[PDB]
């Protein structure tokens, strides 16, 4: 992992929130670069999202 | 008609109880009393159970726990040898949940609770307590997953999921990296299920890390308290004892009047066939046993000399009297009963680790998000 | 000198498989197998144990071969028992000792030759996937290896192209007492024209009996039933419906002049190679009483490597939970006299069928187009 700058739509409503909920937050990103969806994990009865 | 009903225990002076038992219970049909001892080893007790299977034809048979701690691979020959033939078998002293499976273990059924079944009280104690985030530590074994699975049902039954679950195998000397992970978490009750011998390693390793001074609340069974664990063991602790589990007596007279009255009821219907006396001769299935532990289970007894004795549809016990300790100076006193649905404190005062003496809230809410 | 014995049960060509037995040569290694035929009874479990006692301690031997010609299922469980108290690893080749296991022990020795449930039901699937077979319902009973059975067909059935159609999935219990109108009553809800059993040998005649009542069996309704609820060929109980398809293991060109050559080629060259590389071989003192110190030498590793064997061009491996993991199966047929008819053939996962299209056995016609 290397540091990287991030800014947008959804950055500067992160920090809307971060000021009238008075929280620190810690960005970063995912690994795999998907957005979510559930899968079979060697075929098992459970099953788990990604 | 005469019907004789075997056992087998190690004592003599219990063969002494259970003969005074059927004598007494001769004067409530004409029944008799077989017993045998234990040997150091598997085959020799199923050859002496056939033997002695052979030499009675009996149509029951009891059996406890032997004075070894375990008390786990002693049963084992039993069920199965008698099992082979289809007849009840009752356990007086295990603990262990592997007997709760009705596929490897076809006829058999419990007098007391399994360390399994101790998630009810947790359950009750976190409802009465207003507990919400706690977290789950078990092992890697049978009975841990037993526990984290009832545990897991019992929470999703108020559609409640824990905060996390950790496990560690048996026979680890170093669960520092486990530790480390759930002091970042915002639950502060820690619920713990091993073994007396490996959680003597979780206490040595909680007092390195200042997880057990104030704001925690540990959350223990009953194996976890006694054995060498108090030597090693902070303040606060609440822990569990069964009412009269541990001494063998209460139960065998017990036993001996809640499985009479379902063989008179087993002689009063037809096509009755008494189990043969061929332990070596065949190797059929006797038509009784499907019949007899199906009323035998069944059998609502009134009342006993250790309360009242129901089973499940599990051949479990039900119905336990459980007794909430708790660890003030190295010295285990009482606080409460847990009347088998409910519990209820007495006039004694609750001490929680750290020193002070209030209910701790169980959580500690952060400011930083990921 | 590895001491290697081999036991027959019941009616057999003792003067064959005495002939058959020298007709191994494993001159390139140092094996030298000695060999020790003895033949008993079918008395009961206590004579076996017994047996194995005797032959263990009579002259060093290190490992026996099973077969059998009985429908009896317990057998399976007391050679795993047998196995589990002693170090000795035992082998399931015919008879009853091949019949399928719930779960061995963490420490036993004991292999059996025939497929799993996931193989078969993979192997159902493919016959039905063959002749256009898309709509069917599954009907079973309390067993040790129902739910492998329904999990593995729902986990193949949901990650398919095709068109399947499931519905009616029954869990009836044939233990209860005057559950046979609640029975009979569920199971008129069954509409599809392919039923999957998975029951017994007796409590698939007693479905049987109960379903052809009903009078869903006659014309338009397959039933597939699973190997162990033949068993053996030569006997009907003349109540099986014509017409019921039923996947077993090869037993016609395979007989037992092979099938002990095989096992006594696997342990042999086992303790070979365990000999070899190792430099040790596991032979302790050759007894079964007083067993408890026995296990002072660990064995896993003979363990782990009788699970990799090959020889005379053959993959042998075994797996996790102890089956052949690459067996030869057939497909059989109940036609108008009552018998066994071979069909087709199943290996390495190839299915190769006799017949191109299913002789049904009106409203059937047909259509040409364009």
Redesign the interface.
């Given at each position: 992992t290397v540091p990287q700058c991030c800014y947008g739509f959804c950055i500067d409503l992160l920090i809307k929130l971060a000021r009238t909920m008075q929280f620190t937050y810690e960005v970063h990103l995912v690994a795999d670069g998907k957005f979510g969806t559930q899968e079979r994990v060697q075929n098992s009865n459970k099953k788990e999202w990604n | 008609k005469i019907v004789n009903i075997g056992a087998v225990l190690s004592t003599r002076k219990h063969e002494q109880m259970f003969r005074e038992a059927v004598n007494q219970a001769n004067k409530r049909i004409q029944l008799q009393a077989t017993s045998v001892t234990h040997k150091p080893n598997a085959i020799q007790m199923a050859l002496s159970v056939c033997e002695d299977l052979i030499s009675s034809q009996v149509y029951a048979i009891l059996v406890s726990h032997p004075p070894t701690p375990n008390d786990h691979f002693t049963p084992t020959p039993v069920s199965y040898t008698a099992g082979f033939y289809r007849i009840p078998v009752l356990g007086l002293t295990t603990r262990m949940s592997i007997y709760s499976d009705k596929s490897i273990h076809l006829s058999f059924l419990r007098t007391v609770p399994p360390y399994s079944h101790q998630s009810s009280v947790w359950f009750e104690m976190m409802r009465v307590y207003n507990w919400n985030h706690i977290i789950l530590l078990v092992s890697d074994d049978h009975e841990g997953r037993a526990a984290q699975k009832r545990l897991e049902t019992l929470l999703e039954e108020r559609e409640s999921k824990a905060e996390k679950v950790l496990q560690f195998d048996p026979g680890t000397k170093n669960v520092t990296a486990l530790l480390m992970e759930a002091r970042e978490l915002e639950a502060r009750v820690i619920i713990l299920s091993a073994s007396e011998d490996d959680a003597a390693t979780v206490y040595r390793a909680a007092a390195m890390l200042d997880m057990t001074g104030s704001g925690y609340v540990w959350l223990v069974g009953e194996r976890e308290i006694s054995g060498n664990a108090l030597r090693y063991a902070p303040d606060g602790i609440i822990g569990l004892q069964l009412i009269n589990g541990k001494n063998e007596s209460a139960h065998i007279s017990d036993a001996v009047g809640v499985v009479a009255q379902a063989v008179h009821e087993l002689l009063e219907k037809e096509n009755i066939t008494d189990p043969p006396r061929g332990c070596v001769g065949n190797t059929n299935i006797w038509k009784t046993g499907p019949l007899f532990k199906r009323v035998l289970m069944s059998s609502k007894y009134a009342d006993g000399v250790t309360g009242r004795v129901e089973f499940n549809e599990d051949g479990d016990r039900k119905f336990a009297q459980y007794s909430i300790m708790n660890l003030q100076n190295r010295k285990l006193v009482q606080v409460g009963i847990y009347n088998g649905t409910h519990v209820i404190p007495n006039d004694r005062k609750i001490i929680w680790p750290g020193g002070e003496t209030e209910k701790p809230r169980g959580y500690q809410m952060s400011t930083r998000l990921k | 000198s590895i001491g290697i014995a081999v036991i027959l049960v019941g009616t057999s060509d003792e003067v064959a498989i005495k002939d058959a037995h020298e007709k191994d040569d494993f001159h390139h290694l140092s094996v030298v197998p000695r060999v020790e035929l003895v033949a008993m009874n079918?008395?009961?479990?206590?004579?076996i144990?017994?047996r194995i006692?005797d032959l263990m301690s009579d002259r060093k031997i290190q490992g026996v071969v099973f077969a059998d010609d009985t429908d009896?299922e317990?057998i399976a469980?007391?050679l795993d028992?047998?196995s589990a108290?002693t170090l000795t690893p035992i082998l399931g080749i015919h008879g009853g000792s091949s019949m399928i296991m719930?779960?061995k022990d963490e420490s036993s020795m004991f292999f059996q030759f025939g497929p799993s449930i996931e193989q078969q039901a993979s192997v159902m699937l493919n016959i039905m996937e063959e002749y256009d077979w898309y709509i069917f319902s599954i009907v079973t009973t309390?067993?040790?290896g129902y739910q492998d059975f329904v999990?593995k067909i729902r986990?193949t059935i949901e990650?398919s192209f095709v068109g399947w159609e499931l519905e009616e999935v029954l869990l009836l219990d044939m233990?209860?007492?005057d559950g046979d109108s609640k029975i009979q009553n569920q199971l008129k809800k069954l509409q599809s024209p392919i039923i999957l059993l998975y029951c017994t040998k007796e409590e698939a005649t007693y479905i049987f009996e109960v379903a052809n009542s009903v009078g869903l069996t006659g014309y338009g309704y397959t039933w597939i039933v699973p190997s162990l609820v033949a068993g053996d060929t030569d006997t009907v109980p003349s109540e099986f419906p014509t017409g019921l398809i039923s996947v077993s293991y090869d037993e016609w060109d395979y007989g037992l002049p092979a099938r002990v050559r095989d096992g006594i080629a696997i342990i042999t060259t086992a303790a070979s190679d365990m000999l070899s590389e190792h430099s040790f071989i596991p032979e302790p003192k050759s007894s079964?009483?007083?067993?408890?110190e026995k296990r002072i030498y660990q064995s896993n590793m003979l363990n782990r490597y009788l699970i990799n064997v090959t020889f005379e061009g053959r993959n042998l491996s075994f797996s996790e939970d102890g089956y052949q993991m690459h067996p030869k199966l057939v497909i059989i047929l109940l036609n108008k006299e009552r018998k066994w008819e071979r069909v087709g053939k199943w290996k390495d996962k190839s299915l190769q069928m006799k017949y191109y299209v299913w002789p049904r056995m009106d409203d059937h016609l047909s259509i040409v187009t364009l």
């Open positions: - | - | 079918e008395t009961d479990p206590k004579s144990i017994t006692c009896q317990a469980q007391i028992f047998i108290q719930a779960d309390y067993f040790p999990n986990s990650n233990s209860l007492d079964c009483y007083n067993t408890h």
